[PDB]
Structure 1
Amino acid sequence: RGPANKVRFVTAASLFDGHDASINIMRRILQSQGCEVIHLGHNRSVQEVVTAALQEDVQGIAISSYQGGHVEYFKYMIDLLREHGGEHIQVFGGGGGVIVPDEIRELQAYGVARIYSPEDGQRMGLAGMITDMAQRCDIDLTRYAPTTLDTVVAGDRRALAQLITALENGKADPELVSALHAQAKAAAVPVLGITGTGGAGKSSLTDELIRRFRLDQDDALSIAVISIDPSRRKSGGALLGDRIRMNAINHPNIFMRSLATRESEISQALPDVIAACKAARFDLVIVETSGIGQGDAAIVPHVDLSLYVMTPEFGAASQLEKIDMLDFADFVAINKFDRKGAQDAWRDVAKQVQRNREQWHSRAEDMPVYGTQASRFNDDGVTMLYQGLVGALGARGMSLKPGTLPNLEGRISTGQNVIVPPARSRYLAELADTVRAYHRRVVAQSKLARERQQLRAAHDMLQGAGHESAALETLASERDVSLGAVERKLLAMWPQMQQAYSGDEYVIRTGLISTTLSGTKIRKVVLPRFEDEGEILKWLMRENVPGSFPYTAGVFAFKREGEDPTRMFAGEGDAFRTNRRFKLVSEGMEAKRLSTAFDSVTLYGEDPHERPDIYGKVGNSGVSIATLEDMKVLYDGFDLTNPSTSVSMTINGPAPTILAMFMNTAIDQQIDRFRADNGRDPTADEEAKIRAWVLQNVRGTVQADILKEDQGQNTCIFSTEFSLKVMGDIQEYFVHHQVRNFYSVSISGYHIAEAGANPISQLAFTLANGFTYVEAYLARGMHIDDFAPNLSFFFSNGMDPEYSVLGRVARRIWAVTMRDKYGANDRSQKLKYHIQTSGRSLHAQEIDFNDIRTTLQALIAIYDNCNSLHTNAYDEAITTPTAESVRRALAIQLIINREWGVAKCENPNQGSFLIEELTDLVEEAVLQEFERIAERGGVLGAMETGYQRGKIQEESLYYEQLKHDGTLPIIGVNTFRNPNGDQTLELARSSEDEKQSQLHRLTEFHGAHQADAEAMLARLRQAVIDNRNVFAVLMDAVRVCSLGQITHALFEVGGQYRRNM
């Protein structure tokens, strides 16, 4: 037995927060204990969460806030709830170590029910927290329900939401019910029913249709949305996952309620709920059902118009004769028209509907069968369906103004955009084959090389004894031809290779020897001492020395002399403060390697503002960068065009906009340098030469990996397809201007890992994402050798054994595939990557222990010859690295690189039996996962199902189930606790003056370019409309527009991300 009442929750992550790993495993326990959970996903403002909770009429709200600004956020929510009739709604929170004990006592004193610390999680357990949380909200909300329709009919939307909770639970008075239906009949409002197969896109298409209604009628229509999702009767509750897909319902004239089937694809009180909306004087009621079968059609008798939604995949054309809904549907929407066979699917459905209606005197193309693509922003297909629904709703008594939308003609969407052609659908599977095929060759060629040596060895031994037999030589010479050309030269160069790495120098001269205090010569690269040429060739093909194919032990010959791989993530407060932190980290280092962290507001492309939602988050999880002037300040004193200076900005959604700021900054620095060295402005020609030169030599990296945004970090603000479109624009811009030093994308998996994915999943997904970009650019018409060297990677290093060989595996898989499959050059076969130590592996309990873990993780990163390394602070769980805290993190690298003895060898991993076995295992494990993704339609096809997200969240739960369990020992957390139970640690929050500074700088920037602002933004939207290069315009846009202005302008033309649970 579950809870006593129908307990409902609204779960979400705070505004500009991507941390869903926590909240996702809470809505899972909530659902399993028997609670209906209206999950809103990540990045939700207070105005969003409160509106949702009020319309759903829930007992509880669960919010995760890891970005900080949580005090202001929850206070706002508590205030807003009481102000709008939701005081009885209990609010629950959690943010790990971010929300310190003092703030918990404050927030709980303010009105928040409970905020759970990591220590609470240990004591109570995962299920314990949710049990406590659920039992609190186990109350009957039918007492707050109205007794008369006076409130509801007047337009009260809160009374309507409560009346529904009364009707759904059947605690509404019978005389009131009949009185409701009586007025609902006289109301005469149209009811559109939207039904169809599971995951076809019913919710997405619903949202898009509503958006069409808003744009067309200037938000004059009052629309009520009743979405129904199937309820697991085993647990008791359900996962009402329709609202999460709705982006156009955020408006006073729009109302939405999520219902569980609680059984059938319709709630047992659906006619009551519909009638309740009809009496509330809504202009239109829209109903979404659950995943209906072929012969299901229960939505038909309850609505005035029905819309069947399907995908092009329905099997044979004879199946359409079995679908009952094709016999009743007034409109049929074939959604996901971007899928293969969509065209033929439309002809079959159209002809089937024609047959069902017996309209032989009509054309099949005239049937109300529409081809839509709801995922596509401003899809003409969806608009066509809308125009049809308008004409139908118009005749059925619904006053509507002459539309403002393009009254186009046709039944089929013309969205001809493709990221990866269906021909290349199984690209990942092919890559898996390519790698496995390579290894098969290594085995065979080794056998030949071995036999060849064995024969000639025996031949020499026979002649040394007397008995000469040329019969042996015949078999040997037979294997000289059997061996490949490449393989034969490999063994041939082996003795010459040995003599190279033998001496004290590498002849252009490089030292090989580092001598210890004892006087021992530690060689930088240690070669094997095999006698068997079978083992020599095997090793030369599977793990050649650093700087040789397949670059397993590194892509370069020897590690850099002066420029260490160290690159410390930084960002706090305004651009001025962070500019200090850069100088702190890069102090004493001839090579300036900067890594920039932006605050949650900038990460989501928004400008700093006065609203407590946003204000409290400004500059609190990273540097607040809003304008080009802020970006300039951020890197003042740093020569970005200097060969020994590289800047690594971590930004995803607004990455093209931020990149344009960085590029403009790097350009302006050299313009200033010229104006100083010549005492005059450069001429139009001189500037053109300078500007072009800057673009070529500017060194750094922008993350921008959007494929991991859907999968892992959740910093995608525009629609997934649009982000990828602009990302390609960036790479095309790079090629044209010969930007051969900057990395257009850091293909990452760190974020995927920190979300909970084990090292295999992280590595597999990341390489898969990387290959997806490759296939995307190849289908887009760029030479493989033109974009592959610009591809950067980013991984996580945790405690798991696989992390020790994660890097080397990534290098080999890349090198082999890039050579054999894609036939690219040497520069392309070399996978360069950044490794950051796992932050989730560090805990709030016993923070001194974290330096131990961060050391071990940093060690295997350097051992496996990484290209760039970030080291986490000991106060990782609680705050952004303090001044004292960042030095301890920075010392870990310095101690290993300089003091540590084994580290004097650059390939210490090589040779190890464990390492080679682990390397082979992890490699194959990745290849099998490639195949799993391939049989799901590629990376994009998998994301369509939420495969990656599902697999991550599953593994995150499995880990977390064990962390609290004890099966997986965590020192200081689930074992070896402190007898005391532990003070006040210094925190990295942003100054009030710094917030007001950013606000004033912004309004000052806006005032400066007040004339050219609207004009530039208009040009930017036209760039998207006319389908030109978006980034090329951004290079000019960031000079007169702020981050928020640009982002919101793109929203009108590039759409917003549709969350994916």
Structure 2
Amino acid sequence: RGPANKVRFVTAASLFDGHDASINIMRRILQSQGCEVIHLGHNRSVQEVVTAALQEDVQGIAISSYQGGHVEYFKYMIDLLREHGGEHIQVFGGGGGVIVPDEIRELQAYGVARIYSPEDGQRMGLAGMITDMAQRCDIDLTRYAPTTLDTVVAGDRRALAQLITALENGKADPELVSALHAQAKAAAVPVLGITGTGGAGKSSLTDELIRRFRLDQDDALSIAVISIDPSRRKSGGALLGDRIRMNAINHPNIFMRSLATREASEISQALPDVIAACKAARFDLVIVETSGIGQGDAAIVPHVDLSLYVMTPEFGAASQLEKIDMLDFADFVAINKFDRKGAQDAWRDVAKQVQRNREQWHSRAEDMPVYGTQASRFNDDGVTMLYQGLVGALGARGMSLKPGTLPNLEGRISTGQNVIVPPARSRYLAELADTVRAYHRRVVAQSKLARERQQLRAAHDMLQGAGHESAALETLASERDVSLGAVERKLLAMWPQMQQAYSGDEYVRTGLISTTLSGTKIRKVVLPRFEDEGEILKWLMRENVPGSFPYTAGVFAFKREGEDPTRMFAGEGDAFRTNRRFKLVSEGMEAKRLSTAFDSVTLYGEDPHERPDIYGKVGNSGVSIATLEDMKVLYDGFDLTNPSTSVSMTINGPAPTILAMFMNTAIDQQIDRFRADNGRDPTADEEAKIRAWVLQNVRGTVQADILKEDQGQNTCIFSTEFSLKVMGDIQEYFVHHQVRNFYSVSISGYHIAEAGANPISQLAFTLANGFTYVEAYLARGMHIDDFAPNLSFFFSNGMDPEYSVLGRVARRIWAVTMRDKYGANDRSQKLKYHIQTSGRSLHAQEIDFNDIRTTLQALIAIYDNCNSLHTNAYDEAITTPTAESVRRALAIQLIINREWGVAKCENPNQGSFLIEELTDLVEEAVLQEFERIAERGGVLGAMETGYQRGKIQEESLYYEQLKHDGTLPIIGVNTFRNPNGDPQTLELARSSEDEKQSQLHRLTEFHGAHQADAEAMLARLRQAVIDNRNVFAVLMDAVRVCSLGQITHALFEVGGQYRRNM
């Protein structure tokens, strides 16, 4: 048995917070214990969460806040709840080590029920927390329900929400119920039913339709939304996952309640009561979404005034439509996901079927209420067409509405002709798998030939040394000279010459020898001493020396002389403070390698504001950058156009906007440098030469990997498709201006890993995402050798064995595929990547132990010849690195690179039986995962089903189940605890109050400066999206007169918002 009452929760992550890994495994335990969970997903303001909890009438709220600003956040929520009749709703929180003990006691004293620390998780266990959390919220909310309809009819939306909880639980008085239906009948409001197959897009299409209603009627309509999702009878509760897709329901005139079927039927047993309740609440329209219905299911029809059947082009044979009961009753049919293959033919089958069912032979098949929609697409003309149709039908059915402001267009089918990856190339990942496996098959065969060839000629020389000469052997040998390929033959031929190269003290110049205190010569690159030419060729093909195909041991011959791979992530407070931290890290280093971390506000493209939702997060967890002037200040004193200076900005959603700021900054620096070296402004021609030169030589990297946002980090603000569109615009801009030093995208999986994915999943997903971009650009008309060298990677290094060979595997898979499959050049076959030590592998308990783990992870990174390395501080679980903390992190790299003896060799991994076996295993495991994604429609197709997110969250749970368990030993956490129990007072990296006020004053000053050109520039930006030009090209001008928030919100009106994917 589950809880005593019908226990409901609202779960979400705090505002501008992408950390869902924590909250996701909580709503899973909640659901399994028998709770209905209305999951809102990541990035939710207080105003959002409270509104939801109030409309759903829940007993509890669970929020995860890892960005900081949690004190202000929860206080706001507690205040807002009490103010709007939700004092009895309990609030639970968690942020791991971010929420220090003092802040927990403060928040719990303020009103928060419980906030769970990592130490609480260890003591109570995963299920223990949720049990405690659920047992608290096990209360009957029907006592708060109104006894008369006076409140509800008046317009009280909170009373309505509570009346529904009474009606649903059947604790409403019979005389009240009949009185409700009596007024519901006289109410005469239209009830739109939206049903269809599972995952067809019912929720997404509903949200879009509501958006249409708002834009068309200037938000004058009062709409009630009743979404029903199927309930697992085993647990008792359900995962009501419809509200998470709704982005247009955030408005006082919109009300939404999530119902569980509670019958493992497609409608709640009290649905007619709930509908009637909304009708009596004087709503202009009631919309009802059902759960996944079968072919012969149509229970929504008798409860609504209009019914809409939603389907996808994938329905099998055309004869299947004769079995679908809903096609016989539906007033409107929407074929959503019209981007899928065979959408047009699907429409012609459905159209003809509806024509047959209505016996309208005297009508055209194209005139039937069958619409081809694409809800995923922003401002889809298809959806608008369906909307126009619904309006005409709702109008005749007594519903006053003003003459619309929307494009009253004609047609039944969407005209969205955009494609990221053509259906012809759908199985691209599978082909890549074949390519790699095919390469290895050749290595085996060519080795056997090279081996046999040597064995023969060896025996021939031994026979002649004894007397008996047999030319019969030579015939078989010469036979295998031709059997060997041209490339393979030259490999073995250059082998003795190759050995003589790496033998001496120099490489004709580069030194090969570093001598120890003992007087031992440590060769930078150690060559094998095989006699078998089979082993030589096998080695040369599978793992050649660093700087030779397939670049397994590194893409470069020898490691950089002065520029170490070190690149420390940094960001705190305003641009002024971070500019200090940059100078701290890069102090005493000729090569300035910066890595910038932005605050949660900037990461979501928002300007700093006074509201406690946002204000408390400004300057925390990263530098607050809102204007070009902030960006300039951030890198002041750093010559961005200097060859030995590279800047790595970690930004995803607003990445194009931030990149435009950086580019403008690098340009303006050289304009200032010229104005100083000449004492005059450069002419229009001089400036044009300077501006163009900057773009070509500017060295750095912008993350921007949107594919990983949907899957891992959740920093996607615009719609996925729009983000990918603009990301391409950036790469096109780079090509035109010959930006050959900047990396347009750091294809990452670190985030995917930190979410919980094991090294195999991380590596596979990341390479898959990378290959997706390749296919995307290839289908977009760019030469493979034009964008491939601009592709950067990012990985995580944890404690798992596979991490030791993660980099070398990624290099080989890339090199082989780029050569054989895509036929690209050498620069393209070379995969360069950044490795950051695993942050989740570090804990809040016994923080001194983390330096041990971060050392081991940093070691295998350097051993495997990484291109760039970040080291995590010991206080990783609690705060952004302190001045003392970042030095310990920076010392780990310095000690390994300078002091550590084995490190004096640049290929110590090579030869190792374990490394070579692990390399082969991990590689094949990755290839198999490629095939799993390929049979799900590619990366995009898998994302459509939430395959990656599902697999990540599953592995996250599996790990976490073991961490608390004890099966997976974690020193200082689940074993070898402290007899004292010390996790004292540690220094924390929060932002100064003055710094917050500074950013606000700087912003309003910047705004006042370009107040004239502001609206005009933003208008140009939206026209760039409408006319479908290059967005980034406009951003290069936009960031000069517009703030980060202004640009983001302008793009929202034309590029839409990200639809969360659970």
Which bracket does the TM-score occupy, shorter chain normalised? Answer: over 0.9
CA deviations over 1:52-91 (Å, ceiling 9, x no partner) = 0000000000000000000000000000000000000000
Per the TM alignment, residue 694 of structure 1 is displaced from its structure 2 partner at its CA by 0.1
Q: 1:623 matched to which residue of 2?
A: 623
- 1:179: how far off? 0.1
Classify the secondary structure of the residue corresponding to 1:1012: helix
Equivalent residue of 1:814, what SS? helix
Structure 1 counterpart SS, 2:115? strand
Q: Deviations over 1:388-437 (max 9, x none)?
A: 00000000000000000000000000000000000000000000000000
SS at match of 2:593: strand
Q: CA deviation at 1:781?
A: 0.1
| Rounded Cα–Cα distance in structure 2 between residues aligned with 1:232 and 1:517 | 69
Using the TM superposition, give the Cα deviation of residue 14 of structure 1 relative to its aligned residue in structure 2, in angstroms. Answer: 0.0
Following superposition, the deviation at residue 1011 of structure 1 comes to 0.1
Q: Name 2:996's counterpart in structure 1.
A: 995
Question: What's the Cα RMSD here?
Answer: 0.1
Deviation at 1:163, TM superposition (A): 0.1
Cα distance in structure 1, aligned partners of 2:148 and 2:425: 62
Q: How many residues align?
A: 1060
Deviation at 1:259, TM superposition (A): 0.1
Instruction: Provide Cα deviations, 1:917-940, integer angstroms capped at 9, x if missing partner.
Output: 000000000000000000000000
Q: After superposition, give the CA deviation of every residue in 1:607-664 in whole Å (9 maximum; x if it has no partner).
A: 0000000000001000000000000000000000000000000000000000000000
- Spell out the pairing of 1:898-909 with structure 2 (5 A cutoff): 898-909=898-909
3-state SS of 2:193 partner? strand
2:1011 aligned counterpart, secondary structure: coil
Superposed CA offset, 1:308-334 (max 9, x none): 000000000000000000000000000
1:152 Cα deviation from its structure 2 partner: 0.0
Q: Shift of residue 16 of structure 1?
A: 0.0
* SS of the residue 1:6 aligns to: coil
Could you tell me how far 1:670 is from its partner in structure 2? 0.1
- Structure 2 residue runs of 5 or longer lacking an equivalent are none
Deviations 1:940-973 (A, max 9, x none): 0000000000000000000000000000000000
Query: Hey, what's the Cα distance between the residues in 1 that align with 2:784 and 2:69?
Result: 45
Could you state the TM-score of these two structures normalised by the residue count of structure 1?
Answer: 1.00
Q: Counterparts of 1:832 and 1:457 in 2: how far apart (Å)?
A: 42
In the aligned structure 2, how far is the partner of 1:1014 from the partner of 1:62?
40
Offset, 1:210: 0.0
* Deviation of the 1:986 alpha carbon: 0.1
- Per-residue CA distance 1:236-290 (angstroms, 9 max, x = gap): 0000000000000000000000000000000000000000000000000000000
Task: Report deviation, 1:98.
Answer: 0.1
Q: CA deviation at 1:302?
A: 0.1
Match for residue 553 of structure 1? Answer: 553
Counterpart CA distance in 2 for 1:381 and 1:560 is 55
* Cα shift at 1:22: 0.0
Task: Tell me how far apart the structure 2 counterparts of residues 408 and 449 of structure 1 sit (CA, whole Å).
Answer: 70
Report Cα offsets for 1:442-478 as digits up to 9, x if no partner. Answer: 0000000000000000000000000000000000000
Deviation at 1:487, TM superposition (A): 0.1
Q: Distance in 1 between matches of 2:958 and 2:848?
A: 26
Question: What is the DSSP-based 3-state SS (H/G/I as helix, E as strand, rest coil) of the residue aligned with 1:1011?
Answer: helix
| Residue number in structure 2 paired with 1:86 | 86
**1:195-237: per-residue Cα shift (whole Å, max 9, x none)?**
0000000000000000000000000000000000000000000
Tell me the secondary structure at the aligned position of residue 649 of structure 1.
Answer: strand
1:527-572 deviation digits (Å, cap 9, x = unpaired)? 0000000000000000000000000000000000000000000000
Distance in 1 separating the partners of 2:26 and 2:680: 62
Give the alignment of 1:72-471 within 5 angstroms.
72-263=72-263, 264-471=265-472
Q: How far 1:356 moved relative to its partner?
A: 0.0
Q: Equivalences for 1:756-771 in 2 at 5 Å?
A: 756-771=756-771
**1:974-1024 residue CA offsets vs partner (Å, 9 max, x unmatched):** 000000000000000000000000000000000000000000000000000
SS at match of 1:193: strand
Q: Write the distance in 2 (CA, Å) between the matches of 1:847 and 1:911.
A: 36
Q: What CA distance in whole angstroms lies between the structure 2 residues aligned with 1:791 and 1:495?
A: 35
Distance 2:1002 2:17 in 1: 25
Q: What residue number does 2:1053 align with?
A: 1052
Any idea what SS the aligned residue of 1:244 has?
helix
Q: Secondary structure at the match of 1:63?
A: strand
Separation of aligned partners in 2, 1:82 and 1:52: 15
Deviations along 1:679-709, one digit per CA (max 9) or x if unpaired, are 0000000000000000000000000000000
User: How far apart are 1:726 and its partner, in Å?
Assistant: 0.0
Mapped to 2, the partners of 1:619 and 1:792 lie a distance apart of: 28
Question: CA shift at 1:724, angstroms?
Answer: 0.1
- Give the drift of 1:886: 0.0
Give the distance between the partners of 2:756 and 2:985, measured in 1 at CA: 29
Separation in structure 1 between the aligned mates of residue 930 and residue 676 of structure 2, nearest angstrom = 55
Determine the C-alpha separation between the residues in 1 that align with 2:554 and 2:620: 37
CA distance in structure 1 between the aligned counterparts of 2:118 and 2:929, rounded to whole angstroms = 33
Deviation at 1:369, TM superposition (A): 0.0
Residues of 2 paired with 1:140 and 1:492: CA distance?
83
Q: Counterpart in 2 of 1:963?
A: 963
Give how far 1:666 is off. 0.1
The whole-number CA distance in structure 2 between the counterparts of 1:635 and 1:343 is 53
C-alpha distance in structure 1 between counterparts of 2:816 and 2:643, whole Å = 30
- CA shift, 1:495, in A, is 0.1
Once the two structures are TM-superposed, the CA of residue 580 in structure 1 deviates from its matched residue by 0.1
Report the alpha carbon displacement of residue 805 of structure 1 after superposing the two structures with TM: 0.0
Deviation at 1:887, TM superposition (A): 0.1
SS in 2 for 1:460: helix
Per-residue CA distance 1:294-318 (angstroms, 9 max, x = gap) = 0000000000000000000000000
Cα distance, 1:146 vs structure 2: 0.1
**Residue 225 of structure 1 aligns to a residue in which SS?**
strand
CA distance in 2, matches of 1:766, 1:856: 23
Kindly state the Cα deviation for residue 480 of structure 1 after the two structures are TM-superposed: 0.1
Q: State whether structure 2 residue 1060 is matched by structure 1 residue 1043.
A: no
Structure 1: how far apart are the matches of 2:414 and 2:476?
Answer: 66
Matched residues in 2 for 1:50 and 1:145: separation? Answer: 19
State how far apart, in whole Å, the 2-side matches of 1:778 and 1:48 are.
41
Work out the CA distance in 2 between the residues paired with 1:93 and 1:548.
52
Question: What CA distance in whole angstroms lies between the structure 1 residues aligned with 2:798 and 2:339?
Answer: 39
3-state SS in 2 of match to 1:1023: helix
How far 1:26 moved relative to its partner? Answer: 0.0
Report deviation, 1:901.
0.1
Equivalent position SS for 2:1015: helix
Residue 482 of structure 1 and its aligned partner are, at CA, apart by 0.1
Q: Distance in 1 between matches of 2:183 and 2:849?
A: 68
Distance in 2 of aligned mates of 1:113 and 1:580? 40
Q: C-alpha distance in 1, partners of 2:355/2:838?
A: 59
- Find the residue that maps to 1:869 and give its secondary structure: strand
* Cα deviation digits, residues 715-754 of structure 1 (max 9, x gap): 0000000000000000000000000000000000000000
Partner SS for 2:884:
helix
CA distance in structure 2 between the aligned counterparts of 1:926 and 1:1003, rounded to whole angstroms: 50
CA distance in 1, matches of 2:971, 2:617: 33
Equivalent-residue separation in structure 2 for 1:265 and 1:121 (angstroms): 37
How far off is 1:822 after superposition?
A: 0.1
Q: In structure 2, how many angstroms separate the alpha carbons of the residues matched to 1:967 and 1:157? A: 50
Paired residues for 1:664-679 under 5 Å:
664-679=664-679
Cα distance in 1, alignment partners of residues 975 and 708 from structure 2? 34
How far apart in 1 are the matches of 2:996 and 2:515? Answer: 53
Q: Match of 1:883, SS?
A: coil
